[PDB]
Design a protein around this nucleic acid. Sequence first.
RNA 1: AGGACCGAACCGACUAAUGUUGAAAAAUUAGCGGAUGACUUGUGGCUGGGGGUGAAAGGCCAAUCAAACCGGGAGAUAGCU
RNA 2: GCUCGCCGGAAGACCAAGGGUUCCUGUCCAACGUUAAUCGGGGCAGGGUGAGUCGACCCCUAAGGCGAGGCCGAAAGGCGUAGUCGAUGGGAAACAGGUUAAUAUUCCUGUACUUGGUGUUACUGCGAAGGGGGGACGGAGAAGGCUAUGUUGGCCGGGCGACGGUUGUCCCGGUUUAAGCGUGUAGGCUGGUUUUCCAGGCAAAUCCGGAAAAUCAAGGCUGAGGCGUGAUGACGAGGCACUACGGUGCUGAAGCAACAAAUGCCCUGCUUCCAGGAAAAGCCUCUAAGCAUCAGGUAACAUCAAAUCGUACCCCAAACCGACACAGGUGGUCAGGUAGAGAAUACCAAGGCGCUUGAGAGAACUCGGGUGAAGGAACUAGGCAAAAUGGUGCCGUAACUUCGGGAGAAGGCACGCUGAUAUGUAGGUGAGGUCCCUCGCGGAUGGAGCUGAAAUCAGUCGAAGAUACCAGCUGGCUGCAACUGUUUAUUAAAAACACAGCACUGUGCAAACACGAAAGUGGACGUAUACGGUGUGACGCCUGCCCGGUGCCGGAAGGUUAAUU
Lengths: 271, 46, 22, 93
Amino acid sequence: AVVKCKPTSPGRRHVVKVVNPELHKGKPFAPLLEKNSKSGGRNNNGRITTRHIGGGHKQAYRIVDFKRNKDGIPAVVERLEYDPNRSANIALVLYKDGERRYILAPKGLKAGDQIQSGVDAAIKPGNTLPMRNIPVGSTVHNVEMKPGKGGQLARSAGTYVQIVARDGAYVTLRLRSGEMRKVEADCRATLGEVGNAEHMLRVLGKAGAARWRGVRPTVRGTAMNPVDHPHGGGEGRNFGKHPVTPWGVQTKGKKTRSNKRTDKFIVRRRS
Amino acid sequence: MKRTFQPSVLKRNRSHGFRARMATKNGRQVLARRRAKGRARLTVSK
Amino acid sequence: TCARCDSXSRCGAXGKXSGXAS
Amino acid sequence: MIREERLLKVLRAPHVSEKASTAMEKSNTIVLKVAKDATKAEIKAAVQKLFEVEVEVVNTLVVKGKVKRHGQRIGRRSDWKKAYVTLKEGQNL
RNA sequence: AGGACCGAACCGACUAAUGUUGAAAAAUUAGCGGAUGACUUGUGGCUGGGGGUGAAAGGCCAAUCAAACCGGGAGAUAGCU
RNA sequence: GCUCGCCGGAAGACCAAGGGUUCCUGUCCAACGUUAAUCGGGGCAGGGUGAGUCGACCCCUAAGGCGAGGCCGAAAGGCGUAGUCGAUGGGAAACAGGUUAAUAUUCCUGUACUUGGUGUUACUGCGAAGGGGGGACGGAGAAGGCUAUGUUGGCCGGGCGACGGUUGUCCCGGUUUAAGCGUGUAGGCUGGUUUUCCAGGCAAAUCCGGAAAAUCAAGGCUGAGGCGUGAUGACGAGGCACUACGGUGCUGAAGCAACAAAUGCCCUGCUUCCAGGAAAAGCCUCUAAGCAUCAGGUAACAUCAAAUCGUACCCCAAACCGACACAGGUGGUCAGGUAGAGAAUACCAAGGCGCUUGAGAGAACUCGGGUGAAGGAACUAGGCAAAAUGGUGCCGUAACUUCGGGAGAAGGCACGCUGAUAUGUAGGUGAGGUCCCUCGCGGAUGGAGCUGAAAUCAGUCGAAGAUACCAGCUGGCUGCAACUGUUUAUUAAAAACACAGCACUGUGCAAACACGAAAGUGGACGUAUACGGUGUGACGCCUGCCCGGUGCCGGAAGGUUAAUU
């Protein structure tokens, strides 16, 4: 669970770390690793397009299965592994033909559990089946949006999507944000919550803990000059504007959804 | 103190050398002006 | 040349240093 | 490695520079001046087909031209190529 | 164990004095801060001017920066000297 | 040439970068050298850089670059797939001695090693751009084994002292030796082997992975260093004849041990932590197309080949960057003695220097220091600057506190040399001898020799024993900022910026947003416990009332309202 740090120095006084002793204390599975070089927030023009990104620890990418193509073939979990690419943990599972794959680790899953994908699997956490074969009212995760595309909804550390209705070729989903959303019923999804529900309980304690995740410091706009940010200068602390982005678009209340081709999919917006 | 010019032959030839000027339209126009002026050295290159 | 040397002129003498490169 | 026109174009000059004489009487090494593109095989083939002697090995170095000046003008001598040809035991020169 | 303590290399620059046609177009001497980290450094690479980059001072972008430098418009214009 | 002085974690030695003949020798002193110059990094001329193993070139890739086609853009052009480049990384092999005025892992002597082409005897299943394994990797810490290296003893050579003494338990010097080859050790990883099947590895596969029986417990990989050979050699303190003073042809003694010991090696190990730690080839292994007494591979030996470029010299500097023979700047490696915790510091060794104007005199004043009666901050904007404190062990230590701190609070005691406990103790290392053995780089018993802290008692010297160098001033009240950090390169280091935390707001993914005429890329190979923006700034207690103004969100009734007709 979460453990306090004793304040033997400033910068340890407020640290809370999430300890999971059942994670694998060894090197990851080398056939499922690739290279993952940092961008620093730079695109192919070499420009900072997203601010406050850069530095941080080296990472290797873990190829996690989101599609879950291996229908019918049973799989046993070998072990839970730490993944630096996401807020959840992952699970090296072992199929019965000798193929090893990483998946998202759900809530109660440990080493030795039986998982199975496909159309006629069981109903237990870890199994992946289409949403036209699931009892209406259950909490799901790793939810696809197109049939075959790969799971995109509820991938985080402790999130879940609850199926609330079925009509036509569609099921209605109460997303984790508070939004009712119609998805097709050929889209696969995986039972149970994804399992790292104490991830939000950590407090980083110090500035270097944010710096070794690749988060550079954020300068307030009101600390800048008028040429730099619309929140300008002034003698002393003056604000005197309405709060906007660095590009003059009004923040703190102004909606920015303009898509108009996915309005046939949204029953109710979030709150 | 530490000065402006810290020389390096690889960076000099990758920045101002002949293949770098010939690689683009504008460096070829620079070499065209340096031939129209009568310069003995088009680029640095040595 | 370029050392500056006055509090504020374009070029005077002065033993200070923000005004002064001839 | 060999054709006779190239072998007649390889060698230029016997080199006499008071390390050449020490190398002749100490290490059985004659010191020659060769062309700027002559490889070791061409020098060895030219020494055997042109001096009638038999060669252990050929070592080569490139001598870099020295700068000599007059006023605002600076000239440079040519680069040349020195060879150390080691004979087996017997020799004429 | 620790953005832990003291302290050399190393990275900085808090105070004083010297120097100010300097040994130096920003240093020297004596003390001084950090010194396992948000550290520092070699080498290569990318971002280009109303643009970049900025733990943000309008700071830095080749001793130049409230808009670099070079060439051109160009013999701009100047009721001013 | 002899004395003196300075550096000695550098002001010594070797390189990379950069420079480009400054290297060595002869000759010259007009100009250059902040003086003179016979000298020189200066003029003139000549000489000097030798490689299958070192580096480059080469094979392979990272960030990134170019990019057939392709997509997009008035044009120029942009982005990108296949590819092809791109080291700062991965990949074959050589050391020791000597020698030139100037080159050396390159030349010579001795001893080696690696990879290709081709030839001969045999064993035969060979084949790639594809499959698999490996290459292949983080921070920190701790222990063990060593070695470089040093010290002492033994031995060998030389010395018996310009002035009291020096045949002694005295003085000075030397006591060095590599790669390769064999051994496979201290350790570290690992459970091996056979047979049968398979929805996995783009197709296949004897390979990898999975599953199941049978058998067995020693099998394989890795790995410092030690030892033997290498070595009947080389080097080596000193001597034989000579000399053109600078040495060369010549032999050449001992060349042993024990202890201490790295930041180096085993070690890319082991443990532990979260922040979860390159790629691809060489290498091994498996087959598709193709060929099967041929071709191809494998074990052994012979034979040929290993090209081309760099190599001088400087390289914390008078040779690079700074206009200068400029108190500046500049990455890596080597890292001795005594005292010390130490790469601090002090004195020294090897080695290198005395910094390219001197000679005097000994005014004011300026700079850098030393000391100072009595008073002791009276100075001044202000204790600025100086003075002062300063080390190890031990005793002791307040308010407050977030229970960690405060704290090295404050404050104080001992400290040198000699003798004894003990001809040198506890501890550390560890020979000879006895026995056992899966028989060696072993295990017990052992304890010599070597090294050696701190303590206690007594004595004794001085004014002073942390004697030099080195080396905290301390306490009390209070503002701001929680803190470590960051910042106006060159007048401002701060109460500013950041910060962990908190909140509000947007964002349902082909996301919001950003860069871009666009294609597209970042966000992100992430998915609302995530991401972008904005404000406040740890933590404790809290965060009140106002929606009339402006903004934002919601609503659609009515009015007003553009292009169009």
